[PDB]
Design a protein around this ligand. Structure first.
Ligand SMILES: [Zn+2]
Lengths: 182, 166
């Protein structure tokens, strides 16, 4: 049961579309794993649709309708969009080897925020630093313990600069996550 | 006005590739999508470019529209904001997995009637905000306490239904 969601502020940014590709990637992968946050985004989208509908129209150049009508045609743990950044299954992505059994595979994105898949085996821990901005983590498999809480499959953590990081992954299965930093 | 019955017209496109219906939609939403994108800070020419593109997408992804989870204007807003934003992305805002009703079925008339109701309530609330809270809202959707509760609840509710069907 997902007990950790995307903050209202991140959901508002996602609904506004002002988010950087990386963060949008994590937020939306959660959204396709968590119906609760999916319903929240929806209410937020509703605000946009209303502002939309209540905006003074601006005429298009003549012929626009006619123009457009002419050109009209008559892995279960990596699913929302994440699947587009990774091939068939998670076992064969371009994995780098790092500090012991941790492995990471950077994902290609626009914007100035970075996304990557972290592979942390049971028992080891993700070494980490309190970033300058905001870090988003989404567990896709297994889980890991921050002390302030736990995070299992589908749960998302939102670190802030005020933080202290200490995460050790649960023993059992390997905890694979999706992270994004700015 | 049945020519204005957006939901109905979207079903027209979904099931019969009703081009008149599409024109009906376009003549209403295109100019709004344009004005909206300009308030967002786009240049007329680039707005009209996007407007047209958004409308073409409305046609292509017509089947993805679920009248029990959003109004047509919200769905369209969804397609306008997911456009390319250079400094933030290469192609489009990454969006969640597509949950749609297949051609075999459709959401309950009731769930739809209610979704549209709560939406109309949000619209109304939005409209009467004193000009200060109304700007707070706009600044968010343009650059940078509403009844979202009720709407959030229906979608949550409508979403569960969609799940049993699949
Ligand atoms: Zn959630």
């Amino acid at each position: 049961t997902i007990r950790h969601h995307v903050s209202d502020a991140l959901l508002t940014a996602y609904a506004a579309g002002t988010l950087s590709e990386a963060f949008s990637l994590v937020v939306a992968t959660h959204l396709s794993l968590c119906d609760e946050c999916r319903a929240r985004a929806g209410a937020l989208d509703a605000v946009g649709g209303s502002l939309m509908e209540e905006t003074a129209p601006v005429a298009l150049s003549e012929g626009s309708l006619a123009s457009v009508m002419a050109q009209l045609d008559r892995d279960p743990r990596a699913p929302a969009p994440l699947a587009d950044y990774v091939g068939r299954r998670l076992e064969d992505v371009r994995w780098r080897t790092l500090g012991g059994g941790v492995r990471q595979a950077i994902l290609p994105t626009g914007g100035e925020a970075i996304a990557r898949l972290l592979w942390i085996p049971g028992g080891q821990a993700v070494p980490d630093h309190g970033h300058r901005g905001l870090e988003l983590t989404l567990v896709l498999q297994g889980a890991f313990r921050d002390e302030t809480d736990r995070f299992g499959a589908g749960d998302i953590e939102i670190a802030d600069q005020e933080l202290e990081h200490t995460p050790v992954a649960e023993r059992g299965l390997d905890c694979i996550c999706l992270a994004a930093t700015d | 006005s049945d020519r204005t019955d957006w939901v109905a017209l979207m079903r027209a496109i979904r099931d019969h590739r009703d081009e008149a219906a599409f024109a009906e939609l376009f003549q209403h939403f295109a100019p709004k999508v344009k004005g909206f994108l300009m308030k967002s800070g786009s240049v007329a020419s680039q707005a009209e470019e996007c407007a047209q593109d958004v409308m073409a997408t409305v046609w292509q992804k017509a089947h993805l529209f679920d009248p029990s989870r959003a109004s047509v204007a919200t769905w369209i807003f969804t397609i306008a904001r997911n456009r390319r934003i250079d400094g933030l992305r290469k192609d489009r805002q990454p969006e969640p997995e597509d949950l749609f009703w297949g051609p075999d079925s459709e959401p309950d008339q009731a769930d739809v009637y209610e979704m549209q109701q709560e939406n109309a309530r949000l619209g109304r609330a939005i409209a009467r905000l004193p000009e200060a809270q109304r700007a707070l809202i706009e600044r968010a959707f343009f650059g940078d306490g509403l009844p979202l509760g009720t709407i959030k609840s229906r979608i949550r509710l409508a979403l569960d239904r969609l799940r049993q069907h699949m």
